[PDB]
Amino acid sequence: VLSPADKTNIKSTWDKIGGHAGDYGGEALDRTFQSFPTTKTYFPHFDLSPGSAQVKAHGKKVADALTTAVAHLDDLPGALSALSDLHAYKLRVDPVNFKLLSHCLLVTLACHHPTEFTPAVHASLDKFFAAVSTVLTSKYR
Amino acid sequence: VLSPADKTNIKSTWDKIGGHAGDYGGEALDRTFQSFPTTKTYFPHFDLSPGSAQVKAHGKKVADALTTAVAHLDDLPGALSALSDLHAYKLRVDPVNFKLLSHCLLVTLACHHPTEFTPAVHASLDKFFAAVSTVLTSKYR
Amino acid sequence: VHLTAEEKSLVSGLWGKVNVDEVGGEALGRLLIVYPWTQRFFDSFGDLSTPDAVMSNAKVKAHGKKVLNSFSDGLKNLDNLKGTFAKLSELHCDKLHVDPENFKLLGNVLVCVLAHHFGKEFTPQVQAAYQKVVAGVANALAHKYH
Amino acid sequence: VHLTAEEKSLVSGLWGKVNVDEVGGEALGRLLIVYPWTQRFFDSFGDLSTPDAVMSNAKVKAHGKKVLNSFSDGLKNLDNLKGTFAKLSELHCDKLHVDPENFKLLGNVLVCVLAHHFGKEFTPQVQAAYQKVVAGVANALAHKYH
Ligand code: HEM
Ligand code: HEM
Ligand code: HEM
Ligand code: HEM
């Protein structure tokens, strides 16, 4: 479902962003909350005001999770099992919200890395985020 | 993403339907064409009138493909590679249509096997059809 | 939504035979099991942790009956679905924050329940008619989101 | 769709800077690559077999410019999107048979292209405003399906 070319595109793009990933996670969340206000209802405990320390810190966690996924493209269910438990069993996040965050991740990457964000890379990253979303919204105990 | 329980539910349900699978494939197509007329535009070469030999024959092929999938739940991309080539590269079927056919497959099974069609089996079959749909709509050469 | 006289008859013929005490709770129960994120909206309903818990849940059964009656309201008001469901659309959007995609899901689950209950009587022709109904109801409940 | 004065300004400020010869073709091109089933509707457009073929496709570029102009029509008619797009909604439904979900996809791809072109200028605030626009256009083009 992810092609060999997809995996190459994902790994290469993710390596290029390097240590900026954490920041981009924060920005993507900010974009998601601003563009799609209903997503904020999952974070009532968060200060969601500009410059939020909670959002910045959480963005780092999201980025780290995606970094883990990049290292395990052939076994996402195994690698992200704990995150599936959280998002599927405990948080019970509507799959629609994953589409919204994935879109804002693409937007964030396009904003920062125009040379890297080719149509082919765009396509591979969308499939990457979709694959991760499916795992986190699935109950597979 | 498919749970161990899902796989058990899928295998058991599919074995119970046995040789009726081919007929059910035909019925599911008929249901899809009648309920969602836009799906018919993929089959302009087909006689889609009541009692169609083309629909009956094609239903058998669809059922056989699903039977193959049941035998390969841990490697659907490998097992259904040729069907991905057909549906993704050549036919370029909109993913929406897979949701419509999957729904009519569930309806067909519910109509014929009420004892088998428990809420848990219903859930596992929906995930099964979704997994197959993802493979057939993905380009992974 | 516009249904032909023939489609209306197919819908009404089946609907009169529906067990109004069970079908709605079974539809809601199956929604909560097949699409388990929908459970998020039902914290006050108690145990939903297993298929058996969902299907034996008294509140799910009672609420399901109300949902089914609301579908019955739609069947009696097919030419004014937006007007019939405007207040409910407001509730699901502003108070409940239910993503509109889920309305389509419940509609299709209800169809699965009807199929389950009626078997061969739930013909492809009867189904096609019901798909127009459930799409209409889902569209009407989504109207105040736009 | 209702945009506040602030949102309208954020949209208009960026839109005036848009390369009208390139952005639409890039949006359409990316739609055809990221969501490749959309290629089904474009048999008369010639080679779409590779990302490079799609992005160098002269017809994709020309048609993209028309699509972008249609978005520009929406921006000038935000309070009457349904009226502006009714004829186009009819075309995409009755003649073309484009599933409405794809309208949302193109809208989001256009957003990605705007982000690509403007970088840091495409702020979260500017994006939020544009999401209201593209959702409005997608809803308007889907109106005659219901
Ligand atoms: C790209 C897909 C996503 C990834 C990779 C991801 C990753 C993560 C990670 C790593 C955590 C922290 C877990 C821990 O500390 O043990 C987390 C928590 C959380 N996630 Fe996600 N997530 C994703 C999508 C979403 C979406 C779409 C939502 C809903 C809008 C959501 C809602 C939450 C919430 C509410 C928490 C708890 C935050 C806290 O209390 O600190 N997640 N996620
Ligand atoms: C459950 C998912 C599906 C399965 C398992 C499936 C399976 C198959 C199989 C086995 C064939 C015959 C291939 C061959 O003879 O080499 C086929 C062909 C075809 N499929 Fe599907 N399919 C699915 C979904 C769909 C959908 C949703 C559509 C569009 C509405 C579609 C459109 C077609 C068409 C137009 C053909 C060619 C038929 C012919 O010319 O005889 N398929 N599919
Ligand atoms: C198929 C379309 C639907 C119909 C016709 C429908 C109908 C209704 C009705 C009649 C009520 C009671 C209103 C009242 O007395 O205040 C209600 C409430 C409610 N609905 Fe729905 N509904 C639909 C879809 C959904 C979906 C898909 C969800 C969630 C995924 C949902 C979640 C809720 C919740 C959480 C309540 C309040 C329950 C409570 O706490 O008492 N509804 N709905
Ligand atoms: C984002 C919303 C969209 C807008 C604003 C839009 C706009 C337009 C416009 C202005 C035309 C030309 C009408 C004419 O001169 O006759 C057109 C035609 C067309 N559209 Fe779209 N469109 C949208 C979405 C889509 C999508 C998502 C698809 C396919 C997935 C699509 C497929 C087509 C096709 C195949 C044509 C005819 C092209 C030809 O053969 O000349 N459109 N659209």
Curated annotation (Swiss-Prot), chains A, B:
<dbReference type="Pfam" id="PF00042">
    <property type="entry name" value="Globin"/>
</dbReference>
<feature type="domain" description="Globin">
    <location>
        <begin position="1"/>
        <end position="141"/>
    </location>
</feature>
<feature type="modified residue" description="Phosphothreonine">
    <location>
        <position position="108"/>
    </location>
</feature>
<feature type="binding site" description="proximal binding residue">
    <location>
        <position position="87"/>
    </location>
    <ligand>
        <name>heme b</name>
    </ligand>
</feature>
<feature type="modified residue" description="Phosphoserine">
    <location>
        <position position="102"/>
    </location>
</feature>
<keyword id="KW-0007">Acetylation</keyword>
<keyword id="KW-0408">Iron</keyword>
<feature type="modified residue" description="Phosphothreonine">
    <location>
        <position position="134"/>
    </location>
</feature>
<feature type="binding site">
    <location>
        <position position="58"/>
    </location>
    <ligand>
        <name>O2</name>
    </ligand>
</feature>
<dbReference type="GO" id="GO:0020037">
    <property type="term" value="F:heme binding"/>
</dbReference>
<feature type="modified residue" description="Phosphoserine">
    <location>
        <position position="138"/>
    </location>
</feature>
<keyword id="KW-0349">Heme</keyword>
<feature type="modified residue" description="Phosphothreonine">
    <location>
        <position position="137"/>
    </location>
</feature>
<feature type="modified residue" description="N6-succinyllysine; alternate">
    <location>
        <position position="16"/>
    </location>
</feature>
<feature type="modified residue" description="Phosphoserine">
    <location>
        <position position="49"/>
    </location>
</feature>
<feature type="modified residue" description="Phosphotyrosine">
    <location>
        <position position="24"/>
    </location>
</feature>
<dbReference type="GO" id="GO:0031838">
    <property type="term" value="C:haptoglobin-hemoglobin complex"/>
</dbReference>
<comment type="similarity">
    <text>Belongs to the globin family.</text>
</comment>
<dbReference type="GO" id="GO:0042744">
    <property type="term" value="P:hydrogen peroxide catabolic process"/>
</dbReference>
<dbReference type="InterPro" id="IPR002339">
    <property type="entry name" value="Hemoglobin_pi"/>
</dbReference>
<feature type="modified residue" description="N6-succinyllysine">
    <location>
        <position position="40"/>
    </location>
</feature>
<comment type="subunit">
    <text>Heterotetramer of two alpha chains and two beta chains.</text>
</comment>
Swiss-Prot record, chains C, D:
<feature type="modified residue" description="Phosphoserine">
    <location>
        <position position="44"/>
    </location>
</feature>
<dbReference type="GO" id="GO:0031721">
    <property type="term" value="F:hemoglobin alpha binding"/>
</dbReference>
<keyword id="KW-0813">Transport</keyword>
<feature type="modified residue" description="N6-acetyllysine">
    <location>
        <position position="59"/>
    </location>
</feature>
<dbReference type="InterPro" id="IPR050056">
    <property type="entry name" value="Hemoglobin_oxygen_transport"/>
</dbReference>
<feature type="binding site" description="proximal binding residue">
    <location>
        <position position="92"/>
    </location>
    <ligand>
        <name>heme b</name>
    </ligand>
</feature>
<feature type="modified residue" description="N-acetylvaline">
    <location>
        <position position="1"/>
    </location>
</feature>
<dbReference type="InterPro" id="IPR000971">
    <property type="entry name" value="Globin"/>
</dbReference>
<protein>
    <recommendedName>
        <fullName>Hemoglobin subunit beta</fullName>
    </recommendedName>
</protein>
<dbReference type="InterPro" id="IPR012292">
    <property type="entry name" value="Globin/Proto"/>
</dbReference>
<dbReference type="GO" id="GO:0042744">
    <property type="term" value="P:hydrogen peroxide catabolic process"/>
</dbReference>
<dbReference type="GO" id="GO:0098869">
    <property type="term" value="P:cellular oxidant detoxification"/>
</dbReference>
<dbReference type="GO" id="GO:0019825">
    <property type="term" value="F:oxygen binding"/>
</dbReference>
<dbReference type="GO" id="GO:0005344">
    <property type="term" value="F:oxygen carrier activity"/>
</dbReference>
<keyword id="KW-0408">Iron</keyword>
<keyword id="KW-0702">S-nitrosylation</keyword>
<feature type="modified residue" description="N6-acetyllysine">
    <location>
        <position position="144"/>
    </location>
</feature>
<keyword id="KW-0349">Heme</keyword>
<comment type="similarity">
    <text>Belongs to the globin family.</text>
</comment>
<dbReference type="GO" id="GO:0005833">
    <property type="term" value="C:hemoglobin complex"/>
</dbReference>
<dbReference type="InterPro" id="IPR002337">
    <property type="entry name" value="Hemoglobin_b"/>
</dbReference>
<keyword id="KW-0597">Phosphoprotein</keyword>
